[PDB]
Design a protein around this nucleic acid. Structure first.
Ligand SMILES: [Mg+2]
Ligand SMILES: [Mg+2]
Length: 287
DNA sequence: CTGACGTGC
DNA sequence: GCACGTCAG
């Protein structure tokens, strides 16, 4: 037949401590990243200050990306499987810093709208027992003034790492293992750019048949497309943290300044459109 | 929470 | 050969 072997596409599913991915060796980015989060996963003392980005040892160095392709590129290192969903295990969080989970993402988008969607996925664990999330990059076309549709994206670094125009996220949530309740599903596609608090998450929702036709993937193939599957934005709220709750959450976590910056935190919070904190706030214990 | 950035061992 | 206090949104 053909004994020298078929060409290796390199799209083998690679499982880790808490996430699995399929690599795009031509774009140096993942095709899709799948993870499972529960009430137990997001709880833990594993800190991300000990972990830093490094290439995946299992990815062959010919197709692996590196930090040289990201540092001065004007783009951020955006993880698809977030470190916040792996607080229980230091090994699982450390594997999320492999560049086989990273895509070039806008700074404000990574820290803003995409960070709010990741928090909403963690918030769904407070209403569902098991939540599956599929995240990945996209490079969608654009219709020009002459009717011609053209795909165009950017590559950065010596290893041409593709910079996606849009990002997609697929959320599948199960209420309880001991329950006949139907499942909730939602597919969202957001552009890789800074987004404020005006557009709701429902404004970026698309049908699953349209995302599969766009990304060329088939999500959750072991699932039957019966009438049982319900939209996640009807069973749940699909609302992200507004300006108040988000700024209050960030100010609660940034409380470890350990200096006069502690008072500068309430300063920025005070002029931040009148907001107050209910818990124990800056219990300053400074010599 | 999501990022980037510099220096003693 | 590198690896932990600073800062921003
Ligand atoms: Mg990120
Ligand atoms: Mg230390």
């Amino acid at each position: 037949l053909e004994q020298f072997g078929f060409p290796l596409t390199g799209t083998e599913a690679r499982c880790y401590t808490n996430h699995a991915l399929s690599y795009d060796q031509a774009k140096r980015v993942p095709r899709w990243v799948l993870e499972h989060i529960s009430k137990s996963k997001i709880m833990g003392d594993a800190d991300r200050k000990h972990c830093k980005f490094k290439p995946d040892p299992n990815i062959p160095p010919t197709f692996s990306a590196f930090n040289e392709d990201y540092v001065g590129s004007g783009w951020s290192r955006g993880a698809m499987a977030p470190a916040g969903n792996n607080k229980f295990s230091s090994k699982a969080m450390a594997e999320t810093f492999y560049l086989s989970n990273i895509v070039p993402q806008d700074f404000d988008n990574n820290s803003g709208y995409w960070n709010r969607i990741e928090m909403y996925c963690r918030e769904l664990t407070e209403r569902f027992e098991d939540v599956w999330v599929v995240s990945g990059p996209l490079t969608l076309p654009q219709t020009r003034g002459d009717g011609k549709k053209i795909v165009s994206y950017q590559v950065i670094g010596e290893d041409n790492v593709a910079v996606p125009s849009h990002l997609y996220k697929v959320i599948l949530a199960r209420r309880s293992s001991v329950s006949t309740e139907p499942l909730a599903l939602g597919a969202f596609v957001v552009p890789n750019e800074a987004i404020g608090f005006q557009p709701q998450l429902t404004e970026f929702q698309v049908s699953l048949q349209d995302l599969e036709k766009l990304s060329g993937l088939v999500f959750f193939p072991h699932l039957d497309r019966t009438s049982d599957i319900r939209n996640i934005c009807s069973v749940d709220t699909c609302k992200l943290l507004d300006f108040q709750e988000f700024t209050l959450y960030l100010s609660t976590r940034k409380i470890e300044g350990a200096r006069s910056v502690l008072r500068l935190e309430k300063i920025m919070e005070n002029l931040k459109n009148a907001e107050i904190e209910p818990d124990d706030y800056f219990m300053s214990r400074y010599e």
